[PDB]
Tab-separated table of C-alpha atoms in Angstrom:
chain	number	residue	atom	x	y	z
S	162	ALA	CA	-15.760	-16.044	0.542
S	163	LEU	CA	-12.595	-16.528	2.695
S	164	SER	CA	-11.910	-19.425	5.107
S	165	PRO	CA	-11.893	-18.683	8.941
S	166	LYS	CA	-8.058	-19.066	9.017
S	167	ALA	CA	-7.717	-16.550	6.135
S	168	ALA	CA	-10.241	-14.220	7.848
S	169	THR	CA	-8.305	-14.186	11.172
S	170	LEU	CA	-4.994	-13.564	9.320
S	171	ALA	CA	-6.603	-10.713	7.291
S	172	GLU	CA	-7.602	-8.944	10.567
S	173	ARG	CA	-4.054	-9.093	11.951
S	174	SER	CA	-2.621	-7.919	8.570
S	175	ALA	CA	-4.692	-4.722	8.946
S	176	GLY	CA	-3.403	-4.096	12.534
S	177	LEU	CA	0.108	-4.815	11.240
S	178	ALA	CA	-0.358	-2.295	8.321
S	179	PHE	CA	-1.469	0.393	10.797
S	180	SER	CA	1.638	-0.205	12.953
S	181	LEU	CA	3.971	0.024	9.900
S	182	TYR	CA	2.126	3.105	8.617
S	183	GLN	CA	2.493	4.842	12.023
S	184	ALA	CA	6.200	3.892	12.261
S	185	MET	CA	6.841	5.308	8.765
S	186	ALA	CA	4.762	8.474	9.359
S	187	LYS	CA	7.056	9.341	12.362
S	188	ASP	CA	10.110	9.282	10.001
S	189	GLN	CA	10.723	12.883	8.796
S	190	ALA	CA	12.327	11.717	5.491
S	191	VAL	CA	9.155	9.760	4.481
S	192	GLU	CA	6.717	11.745	2.229
S	193	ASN	CA	4.202	9.420	0.416
S	194	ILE	CA	3.264	6.056	1.993
S	195	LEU	CA	1.860	3.014	0.119
S	196	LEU	CA	1.510	-0.292	1.960
S	197	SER	CA	-0.374	-3.426	0.997
S	198	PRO	CA	-1.109	-5.306	4.281
S	199	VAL	CA	-1.347	-8.732	2.609
S	200	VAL	CA	1.979	-8.289	0.775
S	201	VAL	CA	3.596	-7.196	4.083
S	202	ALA	CA	2.069	-10.268	5.798
S	203	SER	CA	3.403	-12.547	3.004
S	204	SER	CA	6.954	-11.144	3.622
S	205	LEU	CA	6.654	-12.376	7.264
S	206	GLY	CA	5.294	-15.715	6.026
S	207	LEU	CA	8.403	-16.072	3.804
S	208	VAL	CA	10.675	-15.414	6.856
S	209	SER	CA	8.679	-18.101	8.798
S	210	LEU	CA	9.069	-20.518	5.850
S	211	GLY	CA	12.824	-19.866	5.387
S	212	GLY	CA	13.675	-19.508	9.096
S	213	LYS	CA	14.124	-21.555	12.280
S	214	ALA	CA	14.067	-21.023	16.094
S	215	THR	CA	13.141	-17.328	17.212
S	216	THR	CA	13.772	-16.072	13.598
S	217	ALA	CA	10.711	-18.032	12.367
S	218	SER	CA	8.658	-17.884	15.610
S	219	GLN	CA	8.969	-14.043	15.814
S	220	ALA	CA	7.546	-13.823	12.249
S	221	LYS	CA	4.483	-15.879	13.373
S	222	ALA	CA	4.180	-13.682	16.525
S	223	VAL	CA	4.090	-10.469	14.386
S	224	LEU	CA	1.135	-12.163	12.455
S	225	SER	CA	-0.515	-13.197	15.856
S	226	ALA	CA	-0.438	-16.723	14.395
S	227	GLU	CA	1.585	-18.536	17.122
S	228	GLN	CA	-1.543	-20.685	17.871
S	229	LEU	CA	-1.770	-21.704	14.124
S	230	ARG	CA	0.248	-24.418	12.384
S	231	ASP	CA	2.958	-23.371	9.854
S	232	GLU	CA	0.892	-24.912	6.979
S	233	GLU	CA	-2.217	-22.962	8.141
S	234	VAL	CA	-0.258	-19.646	7.981
S	235	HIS	CA	1.241	-20.287	4.529
S	236	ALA	CA	-2.097	-21.514	3.070
S	237	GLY	CA	-4.071	-18.707	4.774
S	238	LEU	CA	-1.781	-15.902	3.515
S	239	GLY	CA	-1.648	-17.611	0.082
S	240	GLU	CA	-5.482	-17.590	0.004
S	241	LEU	CA	-5.519	-13.832	0.831
S	242	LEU	CA	-2.944	-13.089	-1.943
S	243	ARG	CA	-5.056	-15.001	-4.518
S	244	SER	CA	-8.279	-13.298	-3.259
S	245	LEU	CA	-6.635	-9.921	-4.306
S	246	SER	CA	-6.454	-11.098	-7.981
S	247	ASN	CA	-10.330	-11.530	-7.812
S	248	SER	CA	-11.771	-8.217	-6.316
S	249	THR	CA	-9.606	-6.307	-8.915
S	250	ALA	CA	-9.190	-6.966	-12.697
S	251	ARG	CA	-6.448	-9.642	-12.239
S	252	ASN	CA	-3.296	-8.614	-14.226
S	253	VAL	CA	-4.868	-5.370	-15.606
S	254	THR	CA	-5.549	-3.077	-12.499
S	255	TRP	CA	-3.483	-5.192	-9.985
S	256	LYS	CA	-0.013	-6.589	-10.777
S	257	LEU	CA	2.188	-8.131	-8.067
S	258	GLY	CA	5.590	-9.825	-8.173
S	259	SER	CA	7.752	-11.090	-5.280
S	260	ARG	CA	11.437	-11.930	-5.757
S	261	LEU	CA	14.146	-13.045	-3.295
S	262	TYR	CA	17.669	-11.983	-4.329
S	263	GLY	CA	20.499	-13.853	-2.622
S	264	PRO	CA	24.265	-13.216	-3.176
S	265	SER	CA	26.032	-15.169	-5.985
S	266	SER	CA	27.795	-17.262	-3.251
S	267	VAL	CA	24.318	-18.551	-2.051
S	268	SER	CA	22.128	-21.397	-3.369
S	269	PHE	CA	18.471	-21.488	-2.229
S	270	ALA	CA	17.269	-24.815	-0.776
S	271	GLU	CA	15.027	-26.785	-3.199
S	272	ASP	CA	12.473	-27.330	-0.409
S	273	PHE	CA	12.235	-23.549	0.252
S	274	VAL	CA	12.026	-22.730	-3.508
S	275	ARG	CA	9.196	-25.257	-3.938
S	276	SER	CA	7.044	-24.043	-0.998
S	277	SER	CA	7.730	-20.272	-1.421
S	278	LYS	CA	6.644	-20.544	-5.105
S	279	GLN	CA	3.572	-22.629	-4.077
S	280	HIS	CA	2.218	-20.373	-1.272
S	281	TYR	CA	3.586	-16.910	-2.113
S	282	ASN	CA	4.369	-17.164	-5.891
S	283	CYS	CA	7.916	-16.117	-4.832
S	284	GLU	CA	10.634	-15.956	-7.468
S	285	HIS	CA	14.341	-16.505	-6.703
S	286	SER	CA	17.445	-14.980	-8.238
S	287	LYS	CA	21.197	-14.896	-7.536
S	288	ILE	CA	22.689	-11.388	-7.605
S	289	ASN	CA	26.261	-10.040	-7.625
S	290	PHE	CA	26.368	-6.956	-5.387
S	291	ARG	CA	30.022	-6.337	-6.535
S	292	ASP	CA	28.881	-4.842	-9.872
S	293	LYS	CA	26.438	-2.456	-8.139
S	294	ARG	CA	25.239	-0.945	-11.490
S	295	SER	CA	24.198	-4.368	-12.917
S	296	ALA	CA	22.650	-5.539	-9.598
S	297	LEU	CA	20.379	-2.404	-9.475
S	298	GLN	CA	19.631	-2.874	-13.205
S	299	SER	CA	18.424	-6.453	-12.544
S	300	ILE	CA	16.140	-5.410	-9.640
S	301	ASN	CA	14.736	-2.406	-11.556
S	302	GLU	CA	14.193	-4.294	-14.854
S	303	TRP	CA	12.404	-7.115	-12.993
S	304	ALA	CA	10.087	-4.579	-11.262
S	305	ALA	CA	9.532	-2.735	-14.569
S	306	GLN	CA	8.525	-5.989	-16.390
S	307	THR	CA	6.322	-7.039	-13.412
S	308	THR	CA	4.399	-3.711	-13.703
S	309	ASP	CA	4.846	-3.254	-17.545
S	310	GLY	CA	6.790	0.006	-17.085
S	311	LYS	CA	4.478	1.609	-14.491
S	312	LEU	CA	7.161	1.190	-11.791
S	313	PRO	CA	10.419	1.623	-13.808
S	314	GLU	CA	12.705	1.809	-10.743
S	315	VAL	CA	12.588	0.270	-7.242
S	316	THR	CA	15.773	1.880	-5.829
S	317	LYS	CA	18.818	3.945	-6.810
S	318	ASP	CA	21.130	2.248	-4.192
S	319	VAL	CA	21.371	-1.025	-2.170
S	320	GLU	CA	22.697	-0.132	1.352
S	321	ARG	CA	23.124	-3.691	2.781
S	322	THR	CA	24.818	-6.007	0.226
S	323	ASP	CA	25.647	-9.055	2.469
S	324	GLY	CA	22.158	-10.602	2.949
S	325	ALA	CA	18.943	-11.633	1.208
S	326	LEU	CA	16.872	-8.923	-0.558
S	327	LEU	CA	13.090	-9.429	-0.731
S	328	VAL	CA	11.496	-7.224	-3.443
S	329	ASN	CA	7.742	-6.758	-3.928
S	330	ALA	CA	6.808	-4.774	-7.067
S	331	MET	CA	3.175	-3.682	-7.491
S	332	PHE	CA	0.885	-1.695	-9.784
S	333	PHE	CA	-2.589	-0.824	-8.497
S	334	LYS	CA	-5.142	1.283	-10.360
S	335	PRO	CA	-8.519	1.641	-8.554
S	336	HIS	CA	-11.333	1.087	-11.118
S	337	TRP	CA	-14.275	3.162	-9.839
S	338	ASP	CA	-17.771	1.673	-9.561
S	339	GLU	CA	-18.927	4.956	-11.245
S	340	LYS	CA	-16.334	6.369	-13.642
S	341	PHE	CA	-15.181	9.985	-13.887
S	342	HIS	CA	-15.753	11.516	-17.344
S	343	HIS	CA	-12.378	11.432	-19.234
S	344	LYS	CA	-12.678	15.170	-20.138
S	345	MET	CA	-13.529	16.266	-16.520
S	346	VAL	CA	-9.845	17.020	-15.836
S	347	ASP	CA	-7.877	20.296	-15.622
S	348	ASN	CA	-4.752	21.936	-14.136
S	349	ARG	CA	-4.938	22.865	-10.439
S	350	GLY	CA	-2.502	23.629	-7.627
S	351	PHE	CA	-1.894	21.051	-4.872
S	352	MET	CA	-0.646	22.543	-1.608
S	353	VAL	CA	2.007	20.160	-0.265
S	354	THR	CA	2.466	22.711	2.605
S	355	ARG	CA	0.873	26.153	3.320
S	356	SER	CA	3.850	27.754	1.392
S	357	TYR	CA	4.576	25.101	-1.320
S	358	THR	CA	2.228	24.354	-4.249
S	359	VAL	CA	2.831	21.927	-7.146
S	360	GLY	CA	0.955	21.892	-10.453
S	361	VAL	CA	-1.254	18.790	-10.885
S	362	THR	CA	-4.018	17.529	-13.185
S	363	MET	CA	-7.246	17.083	-11.141
S	364	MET	CA	-10.233	14.904	-12.056
S	365	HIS	CA	-13.768	15.889	-10.987
S	366	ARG	CA	-17.154	14.186	-10.576
S	367	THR	CA	-20.413	14.531	-8.601
S	368	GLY	CA	-22.235	11.469	-7.303
S	369	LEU	CA	-23.790	9.842	-4.259
S	370	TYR	CA	-21.047	8.807	-1.813
S	371	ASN	CA	-20.838	7.740	1.838
S	372	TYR	CA	-19.579	10.867	3.612
S	373	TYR	CA	-18.906	12.352	7.053
S	374	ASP	CA	-17.650	15.820	8.027
S	375	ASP	CA	-16.133	15.659	11.528
S	376	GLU	CA	-16.611	19.171	12.965
S	377	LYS	CA	-14.831	18.275	16.256
S	378	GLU	CA	-11.661	16.714	14.732
S	379	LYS	CA	-11.786	18.976	11.602
S	380	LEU	CA	-11.666	16.521	8.677
S	381	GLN	CA	-13.822	15.085	5.832
S	382	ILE	CA	-14.195	11.371	4.999
S	383	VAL	CA	-15.578	10.039	1.715
S	384	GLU	CA	-15.955	6.452	0.504
S	385	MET	CA	-15.563	5.749	-3.173
S	386	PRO	CA	-16.725	2.223	-4.135
S	387	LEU	CA	-14.539	0.329	-6.621
S	388	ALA	CA	-15.773	-1.999	-9.453
S	389	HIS	CA	-18.933	-4.007	-8.519
S	390	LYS	CA	-18.760	-2.647	-4.916
S	391	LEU	CA	-16.351	-5.501	-3.961
S	392	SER	CA	-13.985	-2.926	-2.351
S	393	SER	CA	-13.939	0.835	-1.691
S	394	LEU	CA	-11.373	3.592	-1.338
S	395	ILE	CA	-11.784	5.791	1.804
S	396	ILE	CA	-10.093	9.261	1.951
S	397	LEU	CA	-9.541	11.182	5.237
S	398	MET	CA	-8.493	14.785	4.624
S	399	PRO	CA	-8.089	17.564	7.269
S	400	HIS	CA	-10.108	20.794	6.892
S	401	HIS	CA	-6.893	22.864	6.885
S	402	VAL	CA	-3.663	22.544	4.860
S	403	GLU	CA	-1.545	21.059	7.661
S	404	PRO	CA	0.942	18.205	8.413
S	405	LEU	CA	-0.879	14.855	8.699
S	406	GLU	CA	0.706	14.158	12.166
S	407	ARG	CA	-2.408	15.425	14.040
S	408	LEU	CA	-4.869	13.282	12.034
S	409	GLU	CA	-2.473	10.258	12.126
S	410	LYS	CA	-2.742	10.246	15.983
S	411	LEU	CA	-6.536	9.704	15.535
S	412	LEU	CA	-5.980	6.949	12.886
S	413	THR	CA	-6.785	3.810	14.955
S	414	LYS	CA	-8.929	0.709	14.168
S	415	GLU	CA	-11.467	1.916	16.810
S	416	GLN	CA	-11.722	5.549	15.526
S	417	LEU	CA	-11.981	4.370	11.902
S	418	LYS	CA	-14.945	2.129	12.926
S	419	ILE	CA	-16.608	5.163	14.670
S	420	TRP	CA	-16.021	7.393	11.586
S	421	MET	CA	-17.325	4.729	9.176
S	422	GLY	CA	-20.441	4.220	11.326
S	423	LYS	CA	-21.224	7.968	10.939
S	424	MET	CA	-20.955	8.054	7.093
S	425	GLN	CA	-24.195	8.770	5.200
S	426	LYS	CA	-24.815	8.531	1.453
S	427	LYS	CA	-24.901	12.190	0.230
S	428	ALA	CA	-24.280	14.071	-3.042
S	429	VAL	CA	-20.508	14.897	-3.069
S	430	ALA	CA	-18.450	16.781	-5.707
S	431	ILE	CA	-15.083	14.954	-5.494
S	432	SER	CA	-11.869	16.382	-7.028
S	433	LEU	CA	-8.716	14.181	-6.884
S	434	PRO	CA	-5.146	14.600	-8.290
S	435	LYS	CA	-4.837	12.408	-11.422
S	436	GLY	CA	-1.591	10.480	-12.033
S	437	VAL	CA	0.762	7.686	-10.968
S	438	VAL	CA	2.318	7.854	-7.495
S	439	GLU	CA	5.509	5.728	-7.256
S	440	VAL	CA	6.617	4.851	-3.706
S	441	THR	CA	9.422	2.541	-2.565
S	442	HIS	CA	9.760	1.644	1.110
S	443	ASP	CA	12.508	-0.519	2.611
S	444	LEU	CA	10.466	-2.069	5.455
S	445	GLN	CA	13.419	-3.936	7.040
S	446	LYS	CA	14.103	-1.237	9.713
S	447	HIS	CA	10.362	-0.946	10.657
S	448	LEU	CA	9.900	-4.758	10.917
S	449	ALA	CA	12.391	-4.913	13.834
S	450	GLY	CA	10.263	-2.324	15.623
S	451	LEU	CA	7.244	-4.701	15.418
S	452	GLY	CA	8.914	-7.846	16.789
S	453	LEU	CA	10.942	-9.221	13.844
S	454	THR	CA	14.300	-8.540	15.525
S	455	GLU	CA	16.318	-11.707	14.765
S	456	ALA	CA	15.764	-12.038	10.991
S	457	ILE	CA	17.116	-8.528	10.242
S	458	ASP	CA	20.448	-8.975	12.141
S	459	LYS	CA	23.559	-10.625	10.509
S	460	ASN	CA	24.659	-12.071	13.941
S	461	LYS	CA	21.168	-13.268	15.105
S	462	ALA	CA	19.285	-14.487	11.984
S	463	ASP	CA	18.646	-18.171	11.362
S	464	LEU	CA	17.541	-18.436	7.695
S	465	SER	CA	19.066	-21.958	7.367
S	466	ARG	CA	15.845	-23.549	5.972
S	467	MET	CA	16.292	-20.880	3.130
S	468	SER	CA	20.057	-21.553	2.688
S	469	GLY	CA	23.088	-22.854	4.642
S	470	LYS	CA	25.141	-19.687	3.842
S	471	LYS	CA	27.121	-18.329	6.805
S	472	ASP	CA	25.309	-15.390	8.511
S	473	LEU	CA	22.487	-15.063	5.924
S	474	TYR	CA	19.955	-12.458	7.094
S	475	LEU	CA	17.138	-10.324	5.736
S	476	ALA	CA	19.021	-7.226	4.487
S	477	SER	CA	16.029	-5.520	2.789
S	478	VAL	CA	12.255	-5.811	2.265
S	479	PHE	CA	11.467	-3.460	-0.638
S	480	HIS	CA	7.756	-2.670	-0.908
S	481	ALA	CA	7.494	-0.760	-4.210
S	482	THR	CA	4.160	0.383	-5.693
S	483	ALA	CA	2.903	2.438	-8.648
S	484	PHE	CA	-0.618	3.577	-7.545
S	485	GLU	CA	-2.546	5.172	-10.426
S	486	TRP	CA	-5.353	7.687	-9.861
S	487	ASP	CA	-7.252	7.789	-13.160
S	488	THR	CA	-10.776	8.580	-14.397
S	489	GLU	CA	-11.647	5.084	-15.636
S	490	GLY	CA	-14.331	2.943	-14.048
S	491	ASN	CA	-17.690	1.303	-14.793
S	492	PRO	CA	-20.325	3.281	-16.769
S	493	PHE	CA	-23.598	4.270	-15.042
S	494	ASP	CA	-27.153	5.375	-15.918
S	495	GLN	CA	-27.128	9.199	-15.743
S	496	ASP	CA	-30.990	9.320	-15.818
S	497	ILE	CA	-31.254	7.418	-12.458
S	498	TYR	CA	-29.563	10.095	-10.187
S	499	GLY	CA	-30.419	13.092	-12.448
S	500	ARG	CA	-31.618	16.503	-11.171
S	501	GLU	CA	-32.521	17.543	-7.544
S	502	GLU	CA	-30.539	14.598	-6.053
S	503	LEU	CA	-27.161	16.345	-6.947
S	504	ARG	CA	-27.848	20.206	-7.172
S	505	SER	CA	-26.104	21.336	-3.916
S	506	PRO	CA	-23.409	18.670	-3.188
S	507	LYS	CA	-20.861	18.545	-0.376
S	508	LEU	CA	-17.421	19.638	-1.728
S	509	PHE	CA	-14.494	17.202	-1.214
S	510	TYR	CA	-11.560	19.010	-2.873
S	511	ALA	CA	-8.346	16.972	-2.423
S	512	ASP	CA	-5.817	19.798	-3.038
S	513	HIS	CA	-3.673	19.113	0.066
S	514	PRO	CA	-2.234	16.010	1.878
S	515	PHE	CA	-4.710	13.232	2.743
S	516	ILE	CA	-4.733	9.645	4.096
S	517	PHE	CA	-6.392	6.826	2.109
S	518	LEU	CA	-7.345	3.150	2.561
S	519	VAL	CA	-8.666	0.476	0.165
S	520	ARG	CA	-10.986	-1.869	2.122
S	521	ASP	CA	-12.605	-5.179	1.013
S	522	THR	CA	-16.397	-4.738	1.269
S	523	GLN	CA	-17.317	-8.355	2.152
S	524	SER	CA	-14.589	-9.050	4.778
S	525	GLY	CA	-13.657	-5.487	5.818
S	526	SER	CA	-9.937	-6.361	5.413
S	527	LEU	CA	-7.425	-3.716	4.241
S	528	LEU	CA	-6.000	-4.046	0.704
S	529	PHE	CA	-3.980	-0.777	0.945
S	530	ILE	CA	-3.161	2.037	3.388
S	531	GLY	CA	-1.234	5.194	2.491
S	532	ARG	CA	-1.065	8.950	2.231
S	533	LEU	CA	-0.572	11.420	-0.604
S	534	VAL	CA	1.752	14.236	0.497
S	535	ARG	CA	3.700	15.087	-2.700
S	536	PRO	CA	2.032	14.236	-6.060
S	537	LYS	CA	4.182	13.653	-9.183
S	538	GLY	CA	4.317	17.218	-10.585
S	539	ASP	CA	5.940	20.644	-11.141
S	540	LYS	CA	7.037	22.851	-8.122
S	541	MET	CA	5.405	26.303	-8.600
S	542	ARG	CA	7.792	29.331	-8.341
S	543	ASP	CA	7.724	32.903	-9.800
S	544	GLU	CA	9.623	33.314	-13.142
């Protein structure tokens, strides 16, 4: 179990992940979204640790932790990061690395290196943004080794080359509490829009799942428990093939609690696209929108506890994830559910954009929030 300081921080991390998700969903250029609330919260904790004056105090205000001591924030977020390598198969289904890249003309303070490694497992590296090809190669190779090739590239270009670059590289593969059969896969079309379909591999299974069909708001919700029921993946998909904007307006902490209170364990035939979804977000521009305004500006940032370099600021916060949808999970007794209990199931066919969350069962805290709009696959056109 988590301490009361970790529990209060976990609650704010979820509210923070909803705000970032909403801010990113408004951006027309954004297709898939993958955010890990606790990794986002740890990025703010690193700004608090390396900052001073309103630069550090704004980071604590975004985490609603102004009434907590600095040591309570760093130990509380550190506890939540280590509790993630416990609910999942640590270093098999969940890999995380955090690295701060400063220019070659910058030396990180020993005190900051010590404490950022202690609380956030943060790594530090000097980078030369002059040779742009070798700077991108260093970031990408570090992310590729962190995820063992699952995320081979974080970014193709670094826009702001005069500040600190925080990079978070992740690989997450939900391990189902009841596995899909490895041969229960086939080729299907996924409708990105009503006029654009891509070819995907879909995986299929029937089982007893918590489910709700909202006839008023026109969507289905299903809860898929992960290994040992320590967490679960919730999918919210509209009835029609449509942009997720309408359903994203309903996506609040209050409405999610109402929807989850209406879910009943029913027989459901679930079909999901199978594959790795690779998403990179530069969160720097959306962090200013939430209250972290000083850290992200060259002429306002005070990251002097991080380094004494003139005008050092947070240039980028890369949040890069390889999320793998696969059949693997725990085995189960087929004789227990058997016949009658599964003959006429509800059909949850994820062939069009949907929103998803990974929620800790014991604490109710969010591990992940995102949406699948464009799977990795072939655009269908007449030959």
